[PDB]
Structure 1
């Protein structure tokens, strides 16, 4: 039971029109907070805001392609650019959330050491490392798997694969059992390990707070904030990776599952600032 194209287009437009003002307001608030004083959490907030803005910029092409006659209503020259702009933020947000959870765990379980090592330079360096690693992984996978690479067929187009007729969007009509292991490895290394790190840091912070003698209200507020962030990350990223691993396990997957996964991933840009916007 695939969703009608009109409903998909409408929900994409609504999601973009709600996310964009919230995203720009969150970015403005983060910049205003950083102007007075710079904090390690503010760096992650600014990075998340930039990723959300990039995702909103990439949204309209997907929104207009979601129609029935929307196989590829755009030039193919910038198709890899759109694919990167749509794929990078999904893992970038998870990486930023994992880094923030690690920082919170370090500041809670090891307060003296964290205070002695309070340096925004370390946060900027780790953010740059995450950006570089994700970009390098995406580029290597695009070269190895997508057509036009060294291991790809010579008689092919970069991001275009229409063996029958027409012209589809990048990764919209990917050939089954072609980049299955590559997509599975990307999903693992970009979400499952960050998810495990985030869960470990969350449970460690909760244990440290329980062992702490702080006020019950402060502990409850911190636990609620951490749980809300974890629930946001789950409900925004997990379904897409689950669909990817289900497709990798056996090629029987096909139909509206990919559309639902993409819609859930697009809901991230509109749902994340609600719990982490620093308004």
Structure 2
């Protein structure tokens, strides 16, 4: 038993904060929907509108809490409060799962359909709640007595909106909807979160990593050390002669290039350069065992080093190589940080070293990688709000259906945590401020 003033206060704090936050989330999602319609924006707009509807019902639940559960408002307001409070409480979980799945699929695999999915979520929640209420609520179709719709009167002078509803009728309705709109979306969200984590881990490679580090030039240029270079970090020669560089360029492409090439030629030269670096590792006694023991992402950081310095230059880092085979990531990093390579190209070296430390693509913050990070944050954030806010409410529905001998204190706590989804949802969906751009 929570004191009425504490219950009133908790509902008022969720309402006072939820009203501006959801007004800001709707604004953010509407802007994105108008500029470039995306499934994520549609799901975020529906969740924003839903949470705002739940927000506006919170003062009514606050005064009910202050009246110790009695309905201190006109009886005709009970059906309106019923739909404004409970339809968003169940629909929200559906929109969070939809949003999490749209974010995961959009990022791991880089409009009209999303509106259909939202209409289906709203149709199910409104028909499920509507049919049970219209038919089985006190004052409903099956009720023959002079009773206001949704109102029970356990004692004289004490009308109760919904909370005194016969459990034999409300219980199976709450339980079935909790399975479909909370537990299934919870599994979907948990699946998308894991999928996002896995997509970050195996979604990039050496080719993409070297493109960021090397860049692209269609004409012969002098690199950082002054050597004639072309394409994607392809060293033509160390010789102080442009004619020698053009001569080497012509033999590599098999055409009279005159120091200028095509993107396809530069790409084909880059592929030959990566295979050469891979060949150099496998033919080296100190490199091959290290490479074989390494995961896919760390193998790429090893190829990146060989591509930049050559097999021999890399084989000289005997302490770091031993450390890497021993899986002593921080000790290898500390050794590589004292190298001439780090002194000469610190930005490039820090990125490769961080890749050896973490085994992730985090140092290579490309558009694709950032989109995947964003997707993981939304799905992780959705999982947290599902478990903390509406989660205790849906677990209470399941607990009471299986063990109806439980008292009503758990449901009372779950309804308060459910109300706080109006605060946590706009904070996790990412449409506040500048947006998820």
TM bucket (normalised to shorter chain) is 0.7 to 0.9
Aligned-partner Cα distance in 1 for 2:161–2:57: 13
Cα distance, 1:239 vs structure 2:
0.2
| C-alpha displacement of 1:51 | 0.9
1:103-136 per-position Cα deviation (integer Å, ceiling 9, x unaligned):
234334544xxxxxxxx11111221122122211
Q: Distance in 2 between matches of 1:108 and 1:30?
A: 18
Change (3 A) 1:166 1:202: same
Aligned match of 1:103: 102
Q: Matches of residues 1-279 of structure 1 in structure 2 within 5 Å? A: 2-68=1-67, 71-111=70-110, 120-154=111-145, 156-209=147-200, 219-279=372-432
- Rate the CA distance shift 1:179–1:104 in 2: closer, same or farther, 3 A: same
TM-score using structure 1 length:
0.85
Structure with greater Cα Rg: 2
Total equivalences in the alignment: 270
Distance 1:105-1:30 versus aligned 2 partners, 3 A rule: closer
What are the ranges of 5 or more consecutive residues in structure 1 without an aligned counterpart? 112-119
Counterpart CA distance in 1 for 2:11 and 2:170 is 27
Residues 207-226 of structure 1 show CA distances to partners (whole Å, capped at 9, x for unaligned) of 33399999876655543332
Structure 1 residues 53 and 77 mapped into 2: Cα distance closer, same or farther (>3 Å)? same
The Cα of 1:231 is off from its aligned counterpart by 0.9
d(CA) in 2 for partners of 1:165, 1:222: 54
Kindly indicate whether the alpha-carbon contact (under 8 Å) linking 1:177 and 1:251 is maintained by their aligned counterparts in 2. Answer: no
What is the root-mean-square deviation of aligned Cα atoms in Å?
Answer: 2.8
The worse-fitting range, judged by mean Cα deviation, of 137-146 and 220-229 is 220-229
Output the CA distance in 2 between the equivalents of 1:221 and 1:30: 16
Question: CA 1:250–1:70 in structure 2 vs 1: closer, same or farther (change >3 Å)?
Answer: closer
Once structures 1 and 2 are overlaid, which stretch shifts more, 220-229 or 51-60? 220-229
**224-233 or 238-247: which moved more?**
224-233
Normalization by structure 2: what TM-score?
0.56
RCO higher in structure (CA 8 A, sep ≥6): 1
- Map Cα deviations across residues 54-75 of structure 1 (whole Å, 9 max, x no partner): 1111111111111145611111
Contact 2:154 2:164 in 1 (8 A): no
